[PDB]
Amino acid sequence: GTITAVKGGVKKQLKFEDDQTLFTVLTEAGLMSADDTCQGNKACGKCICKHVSGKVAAAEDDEKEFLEDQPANARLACAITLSGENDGAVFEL
Numbered sequence: 001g002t003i004t005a006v007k008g009g010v011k012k013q014l015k016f017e018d019d020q021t022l023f024t025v026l027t028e029a030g031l032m033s034a035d036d037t038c039q040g041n042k043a044c045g046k047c048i049c050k051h052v053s054g055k056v057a058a059a060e061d062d063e064k065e066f067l068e069d070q071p072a073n074a075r076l077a078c079a080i081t082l083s084g085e086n087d088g089a090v091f092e093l
């Protein structure tokens with residue numbers, strides 16, 4: 001499917017393959033850097049993005065630990081495993 005990434009007011013549609021994480025999709029497109037990050041291991045909390053539209057499974061306890069001091073709609077890109085149900089979801093970087 002595909003999701004919409006929004007960086008600097010500019011919308012960019014990206015295609016994703018089932019079971020790919022938003023982190024993988026985002027970083028492999030140059031929209032998000034994987035430098036100094038745990039490389040999508042949900043341990044550094046640097047892959048922050050904002051879920052603004054679409055269906056995305058609620059965050060688990062471990063991820064929530066990293067979003068306590070973040071905006072209400074913040075999520076860890078690597079904590080989100082993309083599947084058909086996420087087709088059309090929009091995220092703001």
Ligand code: FES
Binds near residue numbers: 037038039041042047
């Ligand atoms: S890449 Fe480290 S928490 Fe997502």
